[PDB]
């Protein structure tokens, strides 16, 4: 017997434990699948996806008590009950007062699952939750305060249905969730929820990954995006690959406590073009460029916070403004320009300004194809969105071309029989 066919767990030098291929895998080949050990649908998607299986279907039947959880049918409603029961009564009890973070919501479920199924599940053939790395020793004061705030939230919102271990076990658990947790994104990379996929969590990070993680409802799937030879280590990406090496590494050091040493981080080849400066008479002095990089990266965070307090028109003004100031130094193909154009596109999509979003997207797509890997969902989702926009605006030729560009990547990443693919082909035939 073998826990996962054609693969094995091993000690990756300088990267703790990892996943190794035992046999060859080719582009689009499925390495393995992993059912979710625990998962939670994001609040915003309630009524759009089944709480149990995540099927996106219309006329889902709601729960009689909380009227917040929606399901395919009674079987899905009943199957989900051991988990839903942790929130059902509380969302009624705490009204709008019920605002647990997503992570806290996930951790409650993990605690629940540990209680119901203490033995290894089918989602833990190579790596078990109890084995998750935590980096407790590297956690600073602030991160620790944040974890205690999360623990406090967990007690506040979950105490009657879930028994808790001592404080240190919770610190460890939240710390493991932080460096082994996943987000589930749909075909457009829209946030659906958070989950734990233990065998998937075994794979180490690279900025030029050879596999892609996708989801089929709540089932995690791992497919090759490059050739994988026997004995080779299997690498996925934990983060958005668009940003320059320093940014990626600031995030990886910040969230996962390591500095990536992959080829892209060593050579930094994509960095010149990611940070493209525009060719002028002067040209821009180095100091000014370093200054624009600090400004851009500052505006990224300002923008990220402002989504919470600003109106769409204002966020748009931030984007137009920022792009204008940065365009003095930066070329349009530069990733910091693109981040803002992308955000602006998102605002346009929110204000239902399809034409504006399409105008941003057409401008975003090409530089994206350069900055991201050959098969990237970030690119595929963009082609898909562009395609659906064309299709919705009755421009069928461009719609078909964009949908075909999205499909070509998605067949590799999701597999030819994935329901999203059938959906997109079914969108073209109309």
């Amino acid at each position: 017997a073998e826990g996962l066919g054609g693969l094995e767990r091993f000690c990756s030098p300088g990267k703790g434990r990892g996943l190794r291929a035992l046999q060859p895998f080719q582009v689009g080949d499925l390495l393995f699948s992993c059912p979710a050990y625990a998962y939670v649908l994001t609040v915003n998607e309630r009524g759009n996806h089944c709480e149990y299986c995540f099927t996106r279907k219309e006329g889902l039947s709601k729960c009689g008590r909380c009227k917040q959880a929606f399901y395919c049918n009674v079987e899905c409603q009943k199957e989900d009950w051991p988990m839903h029961k942790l929130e059902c009564s509380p969302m009624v009890v705490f009204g709008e007062n019920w605002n647990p973070s997503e992570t806290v919501r996930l951790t409650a479920r993990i605690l629940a699952k540990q209680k119901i199924h203490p033995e290894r599940t089918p989602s833990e053939k190579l790596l078990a939750v109890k084995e998750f790395e935590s980096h407790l020793d590297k956690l600073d004061n602030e991160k620790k305060d944040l974890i205690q705030s999360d623990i406090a939230a967990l007690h506040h919102f979950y105490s009657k249905h879930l028994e808790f271990p001592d404080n240190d076990s919770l610190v460890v658990l939240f710390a493991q969730v932080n460096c082994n947790g996943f987000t589930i994104e749909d075909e457009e990379l829209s946030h659906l929820g958070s989950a734990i996929f233990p065998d998937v969590a075994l794979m180490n990070h690279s900025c030029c990954p050879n596999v892609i993680v996708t989801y089929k409802g709540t089932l995690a799937e791992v497919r090759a995006v490059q050739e994988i030879k026997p004995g080779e280590e299997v690498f996925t990406s934990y983060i958005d690959l668009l940003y320059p090496t320093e940014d990626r590494n600031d995030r990886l050091r910040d969230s996962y406590f390591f500095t990536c040493e992959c080829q892209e981080c060593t050579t930094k080849d994509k960095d010149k073009a990611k940070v493209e400066i525009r060719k002028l008479s002067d040209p821009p002095k180095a100091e000014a460029i370093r200054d624009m990089v600090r400004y851009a990266r500052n505006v990224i965070e300002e923008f990220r916070r402002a989504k919470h307090y600003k109106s769409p028109s204002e966020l748009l003004e931030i984007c137009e403004l920022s792009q204008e100031k940065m365009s003095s130094v930066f070329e349009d193909s530069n990733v910091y320009m693109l981040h803002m154009m992308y955000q602006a596109m998102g605002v346009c999509l929110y204000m239902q300004d399809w034409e504006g979003a399409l105008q941003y997207g057409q401008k975003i797509i090409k530089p994206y194809s350069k900055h991201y890997p050959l098969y990237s969902l970030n690119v595929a989702s963009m082609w898909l969105k562009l395609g659906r926009l064309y299709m919705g605006l009755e421009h069928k030729a461009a719609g078909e071309k964009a949908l075909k560009k999205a499909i070509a990547i998605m067949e590799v990443a999701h597999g030819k029989d994935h329901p999203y693919i059938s959906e997109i082909k079914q969108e073209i035939e109309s």
Partner: peptide
């Protein structure tokens, strides 16, 4: 940021 494993920076 403070995100879990993700493809698109939210």
């Amino acid at each position: 940021g403070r995100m879990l494993k993700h493809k698109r920076q939210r």
